[PDB]
Amino acid sequence: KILKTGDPLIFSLGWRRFQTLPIYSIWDNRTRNRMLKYTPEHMHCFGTFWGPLIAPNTSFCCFQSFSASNPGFRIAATGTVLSVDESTEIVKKLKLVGTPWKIFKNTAFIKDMFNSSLEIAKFEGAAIRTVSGIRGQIKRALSKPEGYFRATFEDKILLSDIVILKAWYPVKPKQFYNPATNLIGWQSMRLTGEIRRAENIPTPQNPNSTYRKIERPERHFNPLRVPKNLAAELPFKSQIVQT
Amino acid sequence: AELVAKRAWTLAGEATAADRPVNSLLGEDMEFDHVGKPVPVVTEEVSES
Amino acid sequence: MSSLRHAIQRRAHKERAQPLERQRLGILEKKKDYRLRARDYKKKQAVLKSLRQK
Amino acid sequence: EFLRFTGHRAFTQRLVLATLYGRPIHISKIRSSSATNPGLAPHEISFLRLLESVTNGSIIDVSYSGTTITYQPGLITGTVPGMNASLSSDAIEHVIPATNTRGITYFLIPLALLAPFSKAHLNVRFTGPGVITSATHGARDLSIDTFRTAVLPLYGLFGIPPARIELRVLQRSCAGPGGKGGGGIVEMRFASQVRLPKTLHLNRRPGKVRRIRGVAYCTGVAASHNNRMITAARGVLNQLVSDVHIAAQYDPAPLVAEQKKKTGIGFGLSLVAETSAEGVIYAADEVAPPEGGVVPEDIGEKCAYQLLDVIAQGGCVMAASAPTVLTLMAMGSEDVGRLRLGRRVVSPELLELARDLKAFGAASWGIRDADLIVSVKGTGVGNVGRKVA
Amino acid sequence: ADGKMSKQELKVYLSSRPPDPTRKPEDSAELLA
Amino acid sequence: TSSADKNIRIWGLDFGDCHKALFGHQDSILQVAFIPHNSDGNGHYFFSASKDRTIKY
Amino acid sequence: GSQLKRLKASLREQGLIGPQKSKKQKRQNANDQKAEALKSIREQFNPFQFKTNARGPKFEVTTNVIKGRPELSRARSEEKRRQTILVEMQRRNKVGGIIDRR
Amino acid sequence: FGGSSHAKGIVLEKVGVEAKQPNSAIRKCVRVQLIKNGKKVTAFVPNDGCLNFVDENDEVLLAGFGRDIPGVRFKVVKVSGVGLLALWKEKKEKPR
Amino acid sequence: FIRREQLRIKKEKDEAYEKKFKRIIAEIQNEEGRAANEYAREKAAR
RNA sequence: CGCAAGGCUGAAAAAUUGACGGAAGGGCACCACCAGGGGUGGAGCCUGCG
């Protein structure tokens, strides 16, 4: 199994065995320490938990459940302690997603993104982006429909497009700490799959999120439409001949 | 119960305007990129210089 | 290089589709379709600018 | 809240050892006797502010009377660009108020012995009205020149290299009106963060004191003052040493806010005798009284007499820098390190440091004869947070 | 007064860096060229 | 301290710092004098007489 | 009149710009203020530092015209933002502080 | 180096750990200190994800690099007795 | 205000990063190429 | 690497050609006269500026 962030994990680290719940975060391209949602297969990601402090470059092992009825390979993760701190800087991407309302040549009005002109005035000048790749900038809050705004893009966007704003919301790890006092007895916090199978709730699945095959028709464009005054003003060697 | 419960709108990756409450952006502290140079406001040291 | 990458390094990243609540508006234009749209518009504007000069 | 201390003696040593060992302290009954100004002193509360600024996760709590604080320490981060400053090369500003009587080396000595055990660099910049860069009458604080070329070579002995220490003054100042005041700003940049200091060994006799070099500084007085001081100090030390050389330094005046005023008018001298053997240096300083107006030749003779006193007295390290070298020796690895103190060097501050280390959890010290060799067992803590790449 | 040290001793002592302790037309060919 | 370079200096007499050099006469200032009694509340006032036919309070 | 002409007339009235007087005219001046008036001159002849209306008051009431300084107000507001918003942006994630109850 | 074909070393510090682009050669290069002679030379880890197995103060075998920083001569072959390509291929665990 | 502060910080941070890594890559290339040319000279003399 | 990089010190002239005017006479101006026209200013809405 892969091992999710937020789900608890029994760390063997120092003399301590302790069950804590970590936060898995990649170091994006050495810029921001972006929070992942799973550990990557066959890749070292950073983790971050709330436990006792150990001098770094100290290796550790990491299990999921101390049970003999595991059919295969009880140890889950390995690694080494990188550093210790208080108040880590883990950061997760939050995308504010909106929809175009009226589309002019460059300035488009974008509707289903904010709720009020106060929120737009906070996010004034922000780098807004289309799914297609068109960049743009939030210019001005719009008055009459409350929650819409004017954003001047790079080129003309389409009504089918989706207009995103990629903010970075900080995520703090939880401060949970079980000691794995095995000779006395201890309560072991379960995993999310065991919780869902026990208390009978299905896993959340979005149909807009599940990948599909996209049927793209071949893009054919209209021919050139020359205006009448220009087509009547240009000279004889380059005059348009249409029967 | 926290692990099994629904994610907050800040922890969902795509937060459209139907999910969150009304003025819920003002309570958050996010960083984001801006576009273009701002105009320099004329301050008294600038006018003196 | 190219031998220093696993098959999971080589594995393709899939493209998301238009949401089903919004599929009536057409296809979700991504970078490839946007490149086609921009090429056609720049070509038509180049012909129109040459016709205006002439 | 857990560990319990009393009194206002060795207050900064107690807070710094609490930060370094991670042991939460509770210091009670600061000024029980004083009815006029009970509670914490302004330099003490400004050191609390500086400790909160450079650490992270430390919780300091001063009581309503001001006579009891408690302190749960955190990690010494330094100037990280996410928590403490905006850029990694940015100097963390610290302002200390105008009602400050102690010198700036009262803040620099605990910060310099707490700085090699940090995570990032330390880039502290002491500005404000009450920043006196001189010696004080006070509790006889060291000057900036005395502090620099008398105690930072001891970090050079421990393996915290002084190639990366950058202590620079931008204005210099004495006390001024009474003991309060200042004005001269400094900045200290520790860029040399070590895991564990080396277990050093000061055992061989530092016999031949080869040379004397020094600094005579004047801020706000005529520049012939340091020349007269050099002639006085040379008239005393030319009976003993052929090469005494004392630099002369002069600054016009520092200005503080009230509309600015010029404060910190004074002059002082700071001699450093270098022994030919190893990193062994004896220092002495003397400053003019901030209202008195005494003779500069009196000051030069006074600092030369103090230097000959420290040369007569000291085994290897003087008692001004003995707590710093002993607490770094305690922070080193789990071996013994051997310092050679003089029998006259042992002081109540040094003894109180020994009591504080025994209370905190470091091992005791072994004292044998050779002046006495004191041998300290390291505790092997080092610095807690450092990004092992 | 003989307290004026030297530029080298000023460079070690009065700088920001603290002093570490672990130091102690001949010929016609050339003229034509 | 009244000099022949057409100014007077005020020194503090602890550390002897010049309080303010003040150029006040058009010619070489001959003499200066304090009023001795601070019984009237003005003992830090002084007169200065110069070759340009002026006294200045 | 012009701003140049009124500036010259006010400086001739304050005696800062007039003809080169002889030693006898300086004797008359030493026989027989101006910074307090020069402050008013340097405030009046640089009227763009402060915001004024042109019309004057709409309804005259008699009971016993600089209406705002935008330069000074913008600098003051930027100092307030330097003291609060930039400091919070620096200490985004900084836990614990000195709890001063006195 | 020396007279041998492979040298051993201590990884002093992974220089270029804060480089931006992933397969930069400044990201891949590692400053090591050879045991036999004592000098600090620089060596290439063969891959940026393979850099994560190289920890500080680990005994590292290194060989020549025979073919963005032209002139770094060595490449890291084994780390703590286990071959680095085997660690990258997830054949062996690293004994620490 | 947040726009001006973030743009100033981004310019200063990018300039400091570019300067530091130009220094690091230049020093590494200098030392390694010096030792490589010395070894090629000592090998060509054999 | 070397020089720059040592404090009679302590914040706020030029002129044989220059400084300032006056009187007379010209030229121009919907920031002037003359002839008219039109805003704003009264009530409500709101961007912006203070």
mmCIF file with all atom_site columns, C-alpha atoms in Angstrom, chain D residues 158-297:
data_model
loop_
_atom_site.group_PDB
_atom_site.id
_atom_site.type_symbol
_atom_site.label_atom_id
_atom_site.label_alt_id
_atom_site.label_comp_id
_atom_site.label_asym_id
_atom_site.label_entity_id
_atom_site.label_seq_id
_atom_site.pdbx_PDB_ins_code
_atom_site.Cartn_x
_atom_site.Cartn_y
_atom_site.Cartn_z
_atom_site.occupancy
_atom_site.B_iso_or_equiv
_atom_site.pdbx_formal_charge
_atom_site.auth_seq_id
_atom_site.auth_comp_id
_atom_site.auth_asym_id
_atom_site.auth_atom_id
_atom_site.pdbx_PDB_model_num
ATOM 1   C CA . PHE D 1 158 ? 36.678 25.994 19.661 1.00 0.00 ? 158 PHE D CA 1
ATOM 2   C CA . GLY D 1 159 ? 36.428 25.660 15.880 1.00 0.00 ? 159 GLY D CA 1
ATOM 3   C CA . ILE D 1 160 ? 33.737 28.254 15.249 1.00 0.00 ? 160 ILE D CA 1
ATOM 4   C CA . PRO D 1 161 ? 35.958 30.098 12.769 1.00 0.00 ? 161 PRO D CA 1
ATOM 5   C CA . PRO D 1 162 ? 36.261 33.895 12.935 1.00 0.00 ? 162 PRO D CA 1
ATOM 6   C CA . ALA D 1 163 ? 36.526 34.071 9.144  1.00 0.00 ? 163 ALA D CA 1
ATOM 7   C CA . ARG D 1 164 ? 32.729 34.328 9.095  1.00 0.00 ? 164 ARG D CA 1
ATOM 8   C CA . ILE D 1 165 ? 32.045 36.470 12.169 1.00 0.00 ? 165 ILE D CA 1
ATOM 9   C CA . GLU D 1 166 ? 31.107 40.017 11.187 1.00 0.00 ? 166 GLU D CA 1
ATOM 10  C CA . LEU D 1 167 ? 30.717 42.340 14.154 1.00 0.00 ? 167 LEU D CA 1
ATOM 11  C CA . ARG D 1 168 ? 30.765 45.881 12.830 1.00 0.00 ? 168 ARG D CA 1
ATOM 12  C CA . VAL D 1 169 ? 29.827 49.171 14.446 1.00 0.00 ? 169 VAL D CA 1
ATOM 13  C CA . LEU D 1 170 ? 28.291 51.945 12.384 1.00 0.00 ? 170 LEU D CA 1
ATOM 14  C CA . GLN D 1 171 ? 28.211 54.570 15.112 1.00 0.00 ? 171 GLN D CA 1
ATOM 15  C CA . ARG D 1 172 ? 29.988 54.479 18.455 1.00 0.00 ? 172 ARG D CA 1
ATOM 16  C CA . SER D 1 173 ? 28.730 55.886 21.733 1.00 0.00 ? 173 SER D CA 1
ATOM 17  C CA . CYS D 1 174 ? 29.327 56.156 25.448 1.00 0.00 ? 174 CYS D CA 1
ATOM 18  C CA . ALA D 1 175 ? 26.640 56.676 28.099 1.00 0.00 ? 175 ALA D CA 1
ATOM 19  C CA . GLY D 1 176 ? 26.120 60.435 28.149 1.00 0.00 ? 176 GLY D CA 1
ATOM 20  C CA . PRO D 1 177 ? 23.654 61.936 30.621 1.00 0.00 ? 177 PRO D CA 1
ATOM 21  C CA . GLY D 1 178 ? 24.221 59.819 33.689 1.00 0.00 ? 178 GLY D CA 1
ATOM 22  C CA . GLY D 1 179 ? 24.389 56.124 32.966 1.00 0.00 ? 179 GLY D CA 1
ATOM 23  C CA . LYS D 1 180 ? 21.367 56.049 30.671 1.00 0.00 ? 180 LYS D CA 1
ATOM 24  C CA . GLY D 1 181 ? 21.492 56.583 26.930 1.00 0.00 ? 181 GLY D CA 1
ATOM 25  C CA . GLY D 1 182 ? 23.669 55.575 23.995 1.00 0.00 ? 182 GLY D CA 1
ATOM 26  C CA . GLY D 1 183 ? 23.015 55.886 20.259 1.00 0.00 ? 183 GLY D CA 1
ATOM 27  C CA . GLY D 1 184 ? 25.723 53.957 18.456 1.00 0.00 ? 184 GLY D CA 1
ATOM 28  C CA . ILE D 1 185 ? 24.322 51.144 16.335 1.00 0.00 ? 185 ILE D CA 1
ATOM 29  C CA . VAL D 1 186 ? 25.995 47.778 15.722 1.00 0.00 ? 186 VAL D CA 1
ATOM 30  C CA . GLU D 1 187 ? 25.347 44.681 13.678 1.00 0.00 ? 187 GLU D CA 1
ATOM 31  C CA . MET D 1 188 ? 26.611 41.165 14.357 1.00 0.00 ? 188 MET D CA 1
ATOM 32  C CA . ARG D 1 189 ? 26.543 38.459 11.684 1.00 0.00 ? 189 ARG D CA 1
ATOM 33  C CA . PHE D 1 190 ? 27.322 34.905 12.764 1.00 0.00 ? 190 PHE D CA 1
ATOM 34  C CA . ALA D 1 191 ? 27.516 32.797 9.609  1.00 0.00 ? 191 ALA D CA 1
ATOM 35  C CA . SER D 1 192 ? 29.479 29.923 11.190 1.00 0.00 ? 192 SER D CA 1
ATOM 36  C CA . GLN D 1 193 ? 27.058 27.443 12.747 1.00 0.00 ? 193 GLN D CA 1
ATOM 37  C CA . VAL D 1 194 ? 28.737 24.289 14.026 1.00 0.00 ? 194 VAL D CA 1
ATOM 38  C CA . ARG D 1 195 ? 27.243 20.957 15.061 1.00 0.00 ? 195 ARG D CA 1
ATOM 39  C CA . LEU D 1 196 ? 29.440 20.282 18.098 1.00 0.00 ? 196 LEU D CA 1
ATOM 40  C CA . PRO D 1 197 ? 32.295 22.504 19.303 1.00 0.00 ? 197 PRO D CA 1
ATOM 41  C CA . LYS D 1 198 ? 35.675 20.839 19.538 1.00 0.00 ? 198 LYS D CA 1
ATOM 42  C CA . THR D 1 199 ? 36.912 19.667 22.916 1.00 0.00 ? 199 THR D CA 1
ATOM 43  C CA . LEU D 1 200 ? 39.867 21.974 23.279 1.00 0.00 ? 200 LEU D CA 1
ATOM 44  C CA . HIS D 1 201 ? 42.827 21.690 25.632 1.00 0.00 ? 201 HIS D CA 1
ATOM 45  C CA . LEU D 1 202 ? 44.442 24.721 27.270 1.00 0.00 ? 202 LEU D CA 1
ATOM 46  C CA . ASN D 1 203 ? 47.149 23.083 29.336 1.00 0.00 ? 203 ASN D CA 1
ATOM 47  C CA . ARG D 1 204 ? 50.595 24.320 28.331 1.00 0.00 ? 204 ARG D CA 1
ATOM 48  C CA . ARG D 1 205 ? 51.919 27.345 30.151 1.00 0.00 ? 205 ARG D CA 1
ATOM 49  C CA . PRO D 1 206 ? 51.295 30.645 28.331 1.00 0.00 ? 206 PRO D CA 1
ATOM 50  C CA . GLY D 1 207 ? 54.545 32.095 29.587 1.00 0.00 ? 207 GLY D CA 1
ATOM 51  C CA . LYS D 1 208 ? 56.039 34.728 27.301 1.00 0.00 ? 208 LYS D CA 1
ATOM 52  C CA . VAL D 1 209 ? 53.525 37.531 26.831 1.00 0.00 ? 209 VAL D CA 1
ATOM 53  C CA . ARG D 1 210 ? 54.950 38.733 23.546 1.00 0.00 ? 210 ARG D CA 1
ATOM 54  C CA . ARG D 1 211 ? 53.127 41.905 22.601 1.00 0.00 ? 211 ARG D CA 1
ATOM 55  C CA . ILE D 1 212 ? 50.460 44.439 23.531 1.00 0.00 ? 212 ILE D CA 1
ATOM 56  C CA . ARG D 1 213 ? 48.048 45.885 20.979 1.00 0.00 ? 213 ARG D CA 1
ATOM 57  C CA . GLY D 1 214 ? 45.089 48.033 21.831 1.00 0.00 ? 214 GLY D CA 1
ATOM 58  C CA . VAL D 1 215 ? 42.388 50.495 20.852 1.00 0.00 ? 215 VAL D CA 1
ATOM 59  C CA . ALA D 1 216 ? 41.862 53.981 22.295 1.00 0.00 ? 216 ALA D CA 1
ATOM 60  C CA . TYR D 1 217 ? 38.566 55.478 21.165 1.00 0.00 ? 217 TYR D CA 1
ATOM 61  C CA . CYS D 1 218 ? 37.147 58.999 21.456 1.00 0.00 ? 218 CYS D CA 1
ATOM 62  C CA . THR D 1 219 ? 33.552 59.926 20.581 1.00 0.00 ? 219 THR D CA 1
ATOM 63  C CA . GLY D 1 220 ? 32.691 63.580 21.074 1.00 0.00 ? 220 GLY D CA 1
ATOM 64  C CA . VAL D 1 221 ? 35.977 64.800 22.559 1.00 0.00 ? 221 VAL D CA 1
ATOM 65  C CA . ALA D 1 222 ? 39.169 66.103 20.966 1.00 0.00 ? 222 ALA D CA 1
ATOM 66  C CA . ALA D 1 223 ? 41.349 63.647 19.084 1.00 0.00 ? 223 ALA D CA 1
ATOM 67  C CA . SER D 1 224 ? 44.429 64.522 21.140 1.00 0.00 ? 224 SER D CA 1
ATOM 68  C CA . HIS D 1 225 ? 42.822 62.570 23.996 1.00 0.00 ? 225 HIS D CA 1
ATOM 69  C CA . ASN D 1 226 ? 43.843 59.204 22.575 1.00 0.00 ? 226 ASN D CA 1
ATOM 70  C CA . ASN D 1 227 ? 47.365 60.488 21.896 1.00 0.00 ? 227 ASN D CA 1
ATOM 71  C CA . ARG D 1 228 ? 47.742 61.511 25.545 1.00 0.00 ? 228 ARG D CA 1
ATOM 72  C CA . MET D 1 229 ? 46.293 58.144 26.580 1.00 0.00 ? 229 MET D CA 1
ATOM 73  C CA . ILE D 1 230 ? 48.788 56.300 24.362 1.00 0.00 ? 230 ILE D CA 1
ATOM 74  C CA . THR D 1 231 ? 51.680 58.252 25.887 1.00 0.00 ? 231 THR D CA 1
ATOM 75  C CA . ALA D 1 232 ? 50.439 57.378 29.396 1.00 0.00 ? 232 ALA D CA 1
ATOM 76  C CA . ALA D 1 233 ? 49.948 53.677 28.615 1.00 0.00 ? 233 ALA D CA 1
ATOM 77  C CA . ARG D 1 234 ? 53.317 53.482 26.874 1.00 0.00 ? 234 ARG D CA 1
ATOM 78  C CA . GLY D 1 235 ? 54.941 55.236 29.832 1.00 0.00 ? 235 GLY D CA 1
ATOM 79  C CA . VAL D 1 236 ? 53.626 52.472 32.047 1.00 0.00 ? 236 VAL D CA 1
ATOM 80  C CA . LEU D 1 237 ? 54.248 49.476 29.748 1.00 0.00 ? 237 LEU D CA 1
ATOM 81  C CA . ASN D 1 238 ? 57.635 50.539 28.344 1.00 0.00 ? 238 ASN D CA 1
ATOM 82  C CA . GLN D 1 239 ? 59.230 49.280 31.554 1.00 0.00 ? 239 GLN D CA 1
ATOM 83  C CA . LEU D 1 240 ? 58.138 45.785 30.508 1.00 0.00 ? 240 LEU D CA 1
ATOM 84  C CA . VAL D 1 241 ? 57.488 45.463 26.758 1.00 0.00 ? 241 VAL D CA 1
ATOM 85  C CA . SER D 1 242 ? 59.125 46.986 23.686 1.00 0.00 ? 242 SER D CA 1
ATOM 86  C CA . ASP D 1 243 ? 56.099 46.526 21.359 1.00 0.00 ? 243 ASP D CA 1
ATOM 87  C CA . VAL D 1 244 ? 52.943 48.127 22.684 1.00 0.00 ? 244 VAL D CA 1
ATOM 88  C CA . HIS D 1 245 ? 50.902 49.585 19.809 1.00 0.00 ? 245 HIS D CA 1
ATOM 89  C CA . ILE D 1 246 ? 47.507 51.199 20.361 1.00 0.00 ? 246 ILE D CA 1
ATOM 90  C CA . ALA D 1 247 ? 45.253 52.301 17.511 1.00 0.00 ? 247 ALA D CA 1
ATOM 91  C CA . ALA D 1 248 ? 43.483 55.639 17.768 1.00 0.00 ? 248 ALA D CA 1
ATOM 92  C CA . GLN D 1 249 ? 39.833 55.907 16.770 1.00 0.00 ? 249 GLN D CA 1
ATOM 93  C CA . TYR D 1 250 ? 37.660 59.006 16.653 1.00 0.00 ? 250 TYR D CA 1
ATOM 94  C CA . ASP D 1 251 ? 33.983 59.517 15.875 1.00 0.00 ? 251 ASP D CA 1
ATOM 95  C CA . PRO D 1 252 ? 32.198 62.905 15.835 1.00 0.00 ? 252 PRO D CA 1
ATOM 96  C CA . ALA D 1 253 ? 28.994 62.206 17.881 1.00 0.00 ? 253 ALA D CA 1
ATOM 97  C CA . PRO D 1 254 ? 25.918 59.980 17.654 1.00 0.00 ? 254 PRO D CA 1
ATOM 98  C CA . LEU D 1 255 ? 22.452 61.492 17.449 1.00 0.00 ? 255 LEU D CA 1
ATOM 99  C CA . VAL D 1 256 ? 19.383 60.034 19.147 1.00 0.00 ? 256 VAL D CA 1
ATOM 100 C CA . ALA D 1 257 ? 15.784 61.159 19.107 1.00 0.00 ? 257 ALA D CA 1
ATOM 101 C CA . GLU D 1 258 ? 14.373 63.381 21.837 1.00 0.00 ? 258 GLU D CA 1
ATOM 102 C CA . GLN D 1 259 ? 14.333 66.817 16.972 1.00 0.00 ? 259 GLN D CA 1
ATOM 103 C CA . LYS D 1 260 ? 17.574 64.916 17.482 1.00 0.00 ? 260 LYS D CA 1
ATOM 104 C CA . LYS D 1 261 ? 20.228 65.335 20.172 1.00 0.00 ? 261 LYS D CA 1
ATOM 105 C CA . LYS D 1 262 ? 23.922 64.486 20.243 1.00 0.00 ? 262 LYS D CA 1
ATOM 106 C CA . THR D 1 263 ? 24.658 62.073 23.086 1.00 0.00 ? 263 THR D CA 1
ATOM 107 C CA . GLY D 1 264 ? 27.377 59.640 24.062 1.00 0.00 ? 264 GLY D CA 1
ATOM 108 C CA . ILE D 1 265 ? 30.301 61.984 24.656 1.00 0.00 ? 265 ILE D CA 1
ATOM 109 C CA . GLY D 1 266 ? 33.234 60.116 26.132 1.00 0.00 ? 266 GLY D CA 1
ATOM 110 C CA . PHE D 1 267 ? 36.491 58.302 25.571 1.00 0.00 ? 267 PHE D CA 1
ATOM 111 C CA . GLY D 1 268 ? 38.105 55.082 26.676 1.00 0.00 ? 268 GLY D CA 1
ATOM 112 C CA . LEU D 1 269 ? 40.912 52.628 26.148 1.00 0.00 ? 269 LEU D CA 1
ATOM 113 C CA . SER D 1 270 ? 41.166 48.871 25.722 1.00 0.00 ? 270 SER D CA 1
ATOM 114 C CA . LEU D 1 271 ? 44.438 46.941 25.896 1.00 0.00 ? 271 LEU D CA 1
ATOM 115 C CA . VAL D 1 272 ? 44.965 43.358 24.723 1.00 0.00 ? 272 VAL D CA 1
ATOM 116 C CA . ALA D 1 273 ? 48.146 41.469 25.581 1.00 0.00 ? 273 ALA D CA 1
ATOM 117 C CA . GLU D 1 274 ? 48.919 38.566 23.262 1.00 0.00 ? 274 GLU D CA 1
ATOM 118 C CA . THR D 1 275 ? 50.933 35.617 24.534 1.00 0.00 ? 275 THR D CA 1
ATOM 119 C CA . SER D 1 276 ? 53.290 34.012 21.990 1.00 0.00 ? 276 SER D CA 1
ATOM 120 C CA . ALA D 1 277 ? 52.177 30.454 22.825 1.00 0.00 ? 277 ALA D CA 1
ATOM 121 C CA . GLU D 1 278 ? 48.595 30.021 21.614 1.00 0.00 ? 278 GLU D CA 1
ATOM 122 C CA . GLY D 1 279 ? 45.203 31.714 21.683 1.00 0.00 ? 279 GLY D CA 1
ATOM 123 C CA . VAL D 1 280 ? 45.867 33.325 25.077 1.00 0.00 ? 280 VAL D CA 1
ATOM 124 C CA . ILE D 1 281 ? 45.084 37.031 25.447 1.00 0.00 ? 281 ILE D CA 1
ATOM 125 C CA . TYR D 1 282 ? 44.551 39.232 28.488 1.00 0.00 ? 282 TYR D CA 1
ATOM 126 C CA . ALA D 1 283 ? 42.356 42.280 28.090 1.00 0.00 ? 283 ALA D CA 1
ATOM 127 C CA . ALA D 1 284 ? 41.548 45.346 30.135 1.00 0.00 ? 284 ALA D CA 1
ATOM 128 C CA . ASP D 1 285 ? 39.441 48.428 29.547 1.00 0.00 ? 285 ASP D CA 1
ATOM 129 C CA . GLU D 1 286 ? 38.764 51.804 31.111 1.00 0.00 ? 286 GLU D CA 1
ATOM 130 C CA . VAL D 1 287 ? 36.198 54.446 30.200 1.00 0.00 ? 287 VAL D CA 1
ATOM 131 C CA . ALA D 1 288 ? 35.714 58.035 31.309 1.00 0.00 ? 288 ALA D CA 1
ATOM 132 C CA . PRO D 1 289 ? 32.896 58.767 33.754 1.00 0.00 ? 289 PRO D CA 1
ATOM 133 C CA . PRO D 1 290 ? 29.908 60.064 31.770 1.00 0.00 ? 290 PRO D CA 1
ATOM 134 C CA . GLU D 1 291 ? 29.724 63.276 33.825 1.00 0.00 ? 291 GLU D CA 1
ATOM 135 C CA . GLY D 1 292 ? 33.135 63.485 35.476 1.00 0.00 ? 292 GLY D CA 1
ATOM 136 C CA . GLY D 1 293 ? 35.778 64.803 33.137 1.00 0.00 ? 293 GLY D CA 1
ATOM 137 C CA . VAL D 1 294 ? 38.917 63.059 34.380 1.00 0.00 ? 294 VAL D CA 1
ATOM 138 C CA . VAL D 1 295 ? 42.428 63.203 32.925 1.00 0.00 ? 295 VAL D CA 1
ATOM 139 C CA . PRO D 1 296 ? 43.100 60.954 29.898 1.00 0.00 ? 296 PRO D CA 1
ATOM 140 C CA . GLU D 1 297 ? 46.538 60.173 31.323 1.00 0.00 ? 297 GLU D CA 1
#
